[PDB]
């Protein structure tokens, strides 16, 4: 029989009313006043019109079946707000809705990174201006060449072209043959390997040794300011909250702790060795 979801629906619309001028008015007049059955008919009837409009709006974002669904929602909003009293036909008024609802739904579900309408709307005029120029320049227009025709900013044109930059999936064959994908190459940013992990562990254990090698009040005041041993990274003025309660004596003792520690790095073999780093 038929096991394609496409042909099945396309069959069901093929057995649905095809309304006359005066028929549309009869149903529509009752549809506004809520006849229930009337709203269902006008809709069922003009599903055929939605498909013909979705035959041109394909190959842009979603599939043909995805365009019809959202194209049907436009016919529904057209039925929710049609004027039968006006002598003008329905097929005319409904087309404005079905073309709109489709374009809008493509603008959202086309890009992975959700691009709102404002940045997109403008991008189109920049691209459609590129058409005019390309045909008469016979040269794909630059960011400047587009900016000189619109008389608009350089960075705007450039930043709008940056958002046009599309994606390559991390699961995309490299070389058009089973070999390796981008995931088998692209490294992990967050976690750096043991060598970088042990750097900080060994560097920060060496400091725990260097602090117990300083003065009792010098490693208290120096550590609790930077937030090394304490809980919160305080300032020269804020070390007074603890027991210091001083502004001059805290600053002289902080730097006294650092000067004795600078000689501890000159002797152990760092100082200018670990200055490049």
């Amino acid at each position: 029989r038929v096991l394609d979801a496409t042909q099945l629906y396309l069959g069901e619309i093929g057995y649905s009313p095809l309304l006359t001028a005066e028929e549309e008015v009869y149903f529509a007049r009752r549809a506004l006043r809520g006849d229930v059955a009337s709203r269902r008919r006008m809709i069922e009837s003009n599903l055929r019109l939605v498909v013909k409009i979705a035959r041109r709006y394909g190959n842009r974002g979603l599939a043909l079946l995805d365009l019809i669904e959202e194209g049907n929602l436009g016919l529904i909003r057209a039925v929710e707000k049609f004027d039968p009293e006006r002598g003008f036909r329905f097929s005319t008024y409904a087309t404005w809705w079905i073309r709109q609802t489709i374009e809008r739904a493509i603008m959202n579900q086309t890009r992975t990174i959700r691009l709102p309408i404002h940045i997109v709307k403008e991008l189109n005029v920049y691209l459609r201006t590129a058409r005019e120029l390309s045909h008469k320049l016979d040269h794909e227009p630059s960011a400047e060449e587009i900016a000189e025709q619109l008389d608009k900013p350089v960075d705007d044109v450039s930043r709008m072209l940056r958002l046009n930059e599309r994606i390559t999936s991390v699961d995309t064959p490299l070389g058009g043959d089973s070999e390796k994908a981008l995931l088998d190459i692209l490294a992990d940013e967050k976690e750096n390997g043991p060598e970088d992990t042990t750097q900080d562990d060994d560097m920060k254990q060496s400091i725990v040794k260097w602090l117990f090698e300083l003065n009792a009040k010098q490693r208290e005041v120096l550590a609790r300011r930077f937030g090394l041993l304490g809980y919160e990274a305080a300032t020269l003025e804020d070390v007074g909250r603890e027991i210091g309660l001083t502004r001059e004596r805290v600053r002289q003792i902080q730097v006294e702790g650092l000067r004795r520690l600078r000689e501890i790095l000159q002797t152990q073999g760092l100082n200018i060795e670990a200055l490049f780093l």
Binding site: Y9, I43, D171, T198, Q199, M203
Partner: protein, 251 residues
């Protein structure tokens, strides 16, 4: 995740998920409107198409193709066959303390020996240098030991040379047919980018010096050093397991 080139990259799952959620939310919208059933039917068929495409894309019908006219990689696909997690990212693994290079002959070596380039073994035994360095007191910390190695200063070669002595290394040749496709030796540091292999065990690997490459692996744990010396040493592996016959016969 974003590329270095300002581009982004997404897995095909995210794309397949957006197909499911869009259609599912559109069904919520149509159930709000009390739309005619004919439309609700399409929406339900679509929803199923999307769900079935997410679990296993290429199965029920045509697999939903994407950007480069190729089919979207689904969930099941990451568990499925060679290219799945099992065979590719679980039973087979890229491994640290590993290097490969063109092999050449080692007619001076004894059976339990193999040439290992210095700059190769340098990078391979990196944590063992930093370790023996802190012991002697030459490095106070590890980033200090890191720079000592980087500058390639003379006395660092002698430390590297110290750790490697009485330390076996695994030598593999592709393809790994039988167990003897890997044998362990005592590395001999040699100045040059070529590995030097013992002629008699060439038979086991089927290694021809016509431009062959052999993978190196360092046994880290003391158990691995004992395993390599006990089981996987070239001297302890003479006869083939297939036939009670010497595979290290002169040729």
């Amino acid at each position: 995740v974003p590329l270095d080139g300002g581009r982004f990259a997404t897995s095909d799952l995210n794309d397949l998920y957006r197909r499911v959620i869009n259609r599912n939310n559109r069904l919520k919208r149509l159930l709000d409107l009390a739309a005619p059933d004919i439309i609700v039917r399409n929406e339900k068929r679509m929803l199923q198409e999307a769900v079935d495409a997410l679990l296993d894309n290429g199965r029920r019908g045509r697999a939903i193709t994407g950007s480069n006219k190729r089919p979207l990689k689904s969930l099941a696909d990451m568990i499925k066959g060679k290219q799945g997690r099992f065979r590719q990212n679980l039973l087979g693994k890229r491994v640290d303390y590993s290097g490969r290079s063109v092999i050449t002959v080692g007619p001076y070596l004894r059976l339990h020996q193999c040439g290992l380039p210095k700059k190769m073994a340098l990078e391979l035994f990196k944590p063992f240098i930093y370790g023996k360095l802190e012991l002697r007191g030459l490095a106070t910390t590890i980033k200090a030991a890191k720079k000592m190695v980087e500058r390639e200063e003379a006395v660092v070669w002698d430390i590297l040379d110290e750790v490697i002595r009485e330390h076996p290394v695994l030598l593999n040749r592709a393809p790994t047919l039988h167990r003897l496709g890997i044998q362990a030796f005592e590395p001999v540091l040699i100045e040059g980018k070529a590995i030097q292999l013992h002629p008699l065990v060439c038979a086991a690997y089927n290694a021809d010096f016509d431009g062959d490459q052999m993978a190196v692996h360092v046994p880290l744990t003391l158990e691995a050093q004992l395993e390599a010396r006990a089981l996987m040493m070239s001297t302890n592996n003479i006869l083939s397991p297939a036939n009670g016959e010497p595979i290290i016969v002169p040729s």
